[PDB]
Amino acid sequence: GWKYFKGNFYYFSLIPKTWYSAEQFCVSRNSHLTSVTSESEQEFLYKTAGGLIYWIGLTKAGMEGDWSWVDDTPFNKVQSARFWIPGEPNNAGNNEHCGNIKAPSLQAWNDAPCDKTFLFICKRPYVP
Numbered sequence: 001g002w003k004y005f006k007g008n009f010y011y012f013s014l015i016p017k018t019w020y021s022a023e024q025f026c027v028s029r030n031s032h033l034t035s036v037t038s039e040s041e042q043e044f045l046y047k048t049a050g051g052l053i054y055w056i057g058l059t060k061a062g063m064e065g066d067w068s069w070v071d072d073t074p075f076n077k078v079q080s081a082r083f084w085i086p087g088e089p090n091n092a093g094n095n096e097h098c099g100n101i102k103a104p105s106l107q108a109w110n111d112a113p114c115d116k117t118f119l120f121i122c123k124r125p126y127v128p
């Protein structure tokens with residue numbers, strides 16, 4: 001049930017997991033929790049999410065708590081600033097070090113506690 005989009009396959013999970021357990025699942029399937037690197041991809045993901053919440057590859061890295069992509073795509077603070085839900089990231093409770101797609105909109109992302117369970121999206125490149 002992997003969905004194809006611009007050179008990548010995506011797995012929208014049917015079972016919810018914590019952020020890290022999700023990532024481990026993706027890694028077991030030769031993939032990673034999805035990065036988002038274009039408006040086109042953001043649109044594909046939130047539309048396919050159909051109004052439900054899915055973990056994506058967003059997580060904090062380094063001392064400063066800068067956001068990063070688990071698949072090692074460099075995180076672009078400028079190009080991504082538009083992809084957060086208004087008021088996010090807010091580090092609510094000072095325990096929100098992972099990110100998910102939450103709203104069906106270009107402003108889709110929320111930071112939430114990594115230990116919360118949600119559905120999740122894996123991304124795997126097509127390699128011919």
Ligand SMILES: CC(=O)N[C@H]1[C@H](O[C@H]2[C@@H](O)[C@@H](CO)O[C@@H](O[C@H]3[C@H](O)[C@@H](O)[C@H](O)O[C@@H]3CO)[C@@H]2O)O[C@H](CO)[C@@H](O)[C@@H]1O
Nearest residue numbers: 085087088089090091092093095096102110111112113116
């Ligand atoms: C953990 C998390 O996702 N926190 C984000 C926070 O989500 C909370 C928000 O959606 C409110 C809406 O009222 O609901 C919270 O869940 C509650 C259920 O709605 C309620 O039925 C149940 O009994 O209790 C739940 C816990 O109170 C939900 O966690 O939303 C903010 C933005 O507003 C984010 O910044 C947080 O990351």
Ligand SMILES: [Ca+2]
Nearest residue numbers: 090091092111
């Ligand atoms: Ca938040």
